[PDB]
Paper text:
[name] from the cyanobacteria [name] [name] 7942 encodes a putative sugar kinase (SePSK), and this kinase contains 426 amino acids. The At2g21370 gene product from Arabidopsis thaliana, xylulose kinase-1 (AtXK-1), whose mature form contains 436 amino acids, is located in the chloroplast (ChloroP 1.1 Server).
To identify the function of these three residues of SePSK, we constructed [name], T11A and D221A mutants. Using enzymatic activity assays, we found that all of these mutants exhibit much lower activity of ATP hydrolysis after adding D-ribulose than that of wild type, indicating the possibility that these three residues are involved in the catalytic process of phosphorylation D-ribulose and are vital for the function of SePSK. Our SePSK structure shows that the Asp8 residue forms strong hydrogen bond with RBL2. In addition, our enzymatic assays indicated that Asp8 is important for the activity of SePSK. To further verified this result, we measured the binding affinity for D-ribulose of both wild type (WT) and [name] mutant of SePSK using a surface plasmon resonance method.
Author numbering: 2 to 420
The structure:
């Protein structure tokens, strides 16, 4: 099977078509402008540009397509899918009373956030008088795949979570469905299942097979986890980026109020995780990237530095332990910048260690091994510190592109995530 993944991120989009029988692939990209008066136009146009860059011989062989988009970027559209107002982006918060959402979702549901899709929908309900029942709210991924299969009000249970979906009971609440917002909600499917064939006109225009199937999508974060290929409870992916992001596959759903930990359904399993404010940004505050290698190769991880840093880039921590007034702790300073860097790496290591331990203590499946992504993944000193602290196998993730994760989704769905 040849499959196509399309991944829409915060600053651009990437398409990867993969032939999984020959292990062959092609990857194309588009970069978003940093300003627009019509972002939906930008995204749709990007979709066509991506398709157009894929070689015609690849296009004629693609039989499944899936799309991931940024979590919490949503559009308010009419019955035809035409946006009726500017999108509300993933990072935009709405000034609403979360109490107004209390009867529509469980106690500490993840949708109870000023930046959630549900909050944005209610916000639109405040700004408009009453929202016409024939309208619809669509996540970025939803809207984009709609461009390919034509079926309105269709989403997946990843994107839908922040809209108020409860994947533990595979439903929206009866209270939400019967409310004024109910008519605008999508029908929610499992990521990777076929929603419908490609639109005939789109197939002919782009030289795709008219029997090509468009699948339910996912989020960009989740697609990045799918890229790793990990599918056994206890397997995790650490993203050593500007911030440290942990994702852990678990037999059981876990969550935590103060730290905002929650879980996505992933087949018969659950994907939990957390994001610290600590990360590579802290390192960049003291060392140019060229200097980090020069110094790293001078560190012997087998001997302790004696330093006990908490490597925040600024005030406040959210995970593993929430403290809005948590201070960066970078004292004392050694004379040697090698030793200072070692202390920083030890602190970041402690953040990862404590993170997975916390997740386990919340009930997640005990860590079995770690796949590493991001800028810090190729740092072997840091990897050694992490192995020593955590005591499970750690390696660089084979693949880290959201588009490749989404290609795998298109091709195999979530079948691997069952016993």
């Amino acid at each position: 099977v040849v499959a196509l993944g399309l991944a829409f991120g915060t600053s651009g989009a990437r398409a990867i078509a993969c032939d999984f029988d020959s292990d062959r692939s092609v990857s194309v990209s588009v970069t978003f402008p940093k300003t627009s008066q019509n972002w939906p136009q930008v995204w749709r146009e990007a979709l066509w540009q991506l398709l157009t860059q894929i070689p015609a011989d690849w296009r004629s062989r693609i039989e499944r397509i899936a799309i991931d988009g940024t979590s919490g970027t949503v559009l308010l559209c009419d019955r035809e899918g035409q946006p009726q107002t500017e999108p509300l982006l993933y990072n935009q918060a709405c000034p609403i009373d979360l109490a107004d959402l209390a009867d529509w979702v469980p106690a500490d549901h993840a949708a109870l956030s000023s930046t959630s899709s549900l909050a944005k929908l209610w916000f639109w309900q405040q700004q408009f008088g009453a929202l016409p029942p024939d309208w619809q709210i669509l996540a970025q991924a939803d809207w984009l795949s709609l461009q390919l299969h034509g079926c309105s009000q269709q989403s997946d249970y990843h994107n839908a979570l922040k809209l108020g979906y409860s994947p533990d009971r595979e439903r929206f609440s009866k209270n939400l469905l019967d409310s004024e917002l109910g008519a605008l909600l999508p029908v929610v499917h499992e990521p990777g299942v076929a929603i419908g064939p490609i639109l005939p006109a789109i197939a002919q225009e782009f030289g795709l097979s008219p029997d090509c199937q468009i699948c339910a999508g996912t989020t960009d974060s989740i697609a990045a986890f799918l890229a790793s290929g990990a599918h056994q409870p206890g397997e995790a992916v650490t993203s050593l980026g500007s911030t440290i992001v942990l994702k852990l596959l678990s037999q059981v759903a876990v969550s935590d109020r103060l730290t905002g930990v929650y879980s996505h359904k992933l087949g018969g399993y659950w994907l939990t995780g957390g994001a610290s404010n600590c990360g590579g940004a802290t390192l960049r505050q003291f060392f140019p990237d060229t200097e980090l290698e020069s110094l790293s190769c001078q560190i012997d991880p087998t001997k302790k530095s004696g330093l006990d840093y908490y490597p925040l880039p600024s005030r406040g921590e959210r995970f593993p332990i929430a403290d809005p007034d948590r201070l960066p702790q970078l004292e004392p300073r050694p004379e040697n910048p090698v030793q200072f860097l070692q202390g920083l790496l030890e602190g970041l290591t402690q953040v990862e260690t404590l993170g997975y331990q916390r997740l386990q203590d919340l009930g997640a499946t005990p860590l079995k091994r770690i796949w590493t992504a991001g800028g810090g993944a190729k740092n072997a000193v840091w990897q050694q510190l992490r192995q020593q602290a955590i005591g499970v196998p750690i390696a660089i993730a084979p693949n880290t592109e959201a588009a490749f994760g989404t290609a795998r989704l298109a091709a195999f769905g979530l079948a691997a995530f069952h016993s």
